[PDB]
């Protein structure tokens, strides 16, 4: 009937500030499409296979990294900048840790571990 379309290399590696889009469904196969009823429709079901996809699954289901390169330039006073991350997973993505290297003097206030 229908099993898989693919599109695993494209979307996962595409120009997406997210990744692993529509990945959980791959293992979650299930399937009960076969079968037709007669609500006096006409009943014309042919082939019923898989093909292509939205092709625009962009920016779905993981963290974000808005800042890519910071131009601090000359630092002479206490500066404050925002850092944000957006998780689109239906389940949280817990950060393992923040290994601070040469980052002494940089602190985050109002946030837990």
User: Which experimental technique did the depositors report for determining this structure?
Assistant: cryo-EM
Structure resolution in Å? Answer: 4.5
Instruction: Write out the E strands in the chain.
Output: none
Looking up tokens 């019923």 gives 48
Residue 49's closest CA among 10, 4, 14? 4
| Whole-angstrom distance, CA of residue 86 vs CA of residue 109 | 19
How many CB atoms lie under 10 A from the CB of residue 89? 14
Q: By three-state DSSP, how is residue 48 classified?
A: coil
């Amino acid at each position: 009937e229908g099993i898989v379309a693919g599109i695993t290399p494209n979307i996962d590696a595409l120009e997406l500030n997210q990744d692993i889009s529509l990945a959980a469904v791959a293992a979650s196969t299930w399937g009960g499409a076969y079968g037709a009823h007669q609500p006096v429709e006409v009943i014309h079901s042919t082939y019923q296979a898989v093909h292509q996809s939205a092709l625009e699954e962009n920016y779905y289901n993981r963290l974000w990294l808005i800042p890519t390169a910071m131009e601090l330039g000359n630092v002479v006073s206490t500066q404050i900048r925002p850092a944000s991350v957006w998780n689109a997973y239906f389940s949280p993505r817990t950060l393992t840790a923040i290994d601070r290297e040469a980052a002494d003097g940089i602190t985050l206030s109002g946030q837990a571990s």
